[PDB]
Design a protein around this ligand. Structure first.
Ligand SMILES: [Mg+2]
Ligand SMILES: [Mg+2]
Ligand SMILES: [Mg+2]
Ligand SMILES: [Mg+2]
Ligand SMILES: [Mg+2]
Length: 94
RNA sequence: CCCAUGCGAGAGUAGGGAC
RNA sequence: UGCCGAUGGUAGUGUGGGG
């Protein structure tokens, strides 16, 4: 099972997102179901290595944010236009 | 082009549909 | 441009600064 550690974002928007990426992290979003969407931030390198395995995109993953696990599937990924980096990820609740 | 701050598409995604 | 349509990200951008 893939276990991803994340934190809830304290700020959003272009400025905040660029700050994260300049600091070796990147934004992501968890949506789906009855609960409201949850905007989170991830460690770039750790997730990048994880998603290098094809199962990352087929399996139900576990994101540890706050203190509980959420159970999601990768729904979409935005990659840098010309750099080997992850820009954003959509996670859908499972 | 970048930073701070405010504003924020187009496309696509979740979801919905008496079609 | 052919049904409606979030959230987040992206483009662009007002103000101030940097270059
Ligand atoms: Mg700005
Ligand atoms: Mg739109
Ligand atoms: Mg749209
Ligand atoms: Mg449907
Ligand atoms: Mg938006």
């Amino acid at each position: 099972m893939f276990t991803i550690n994340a934190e809830v974002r304290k700020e959003q928007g272009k400025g905040a997102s660029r700050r994260l990426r300049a600091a070796n992290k990147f934004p992501a979003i968890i949506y789906g179901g009855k609960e409201a969407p949850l905007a989170i931030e991830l460690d770039h390198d750790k997730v990048m290595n994880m998603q290098a395995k094809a199962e990352f995109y087929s399996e139900v993953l576990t994101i540890v944010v706050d203190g509980k696990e959420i159970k999601v599937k990768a729904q979409d990924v935005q990659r840098h236009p010309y750099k080997p980096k992850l820009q954003h990820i959509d996670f859908v609740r499972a």
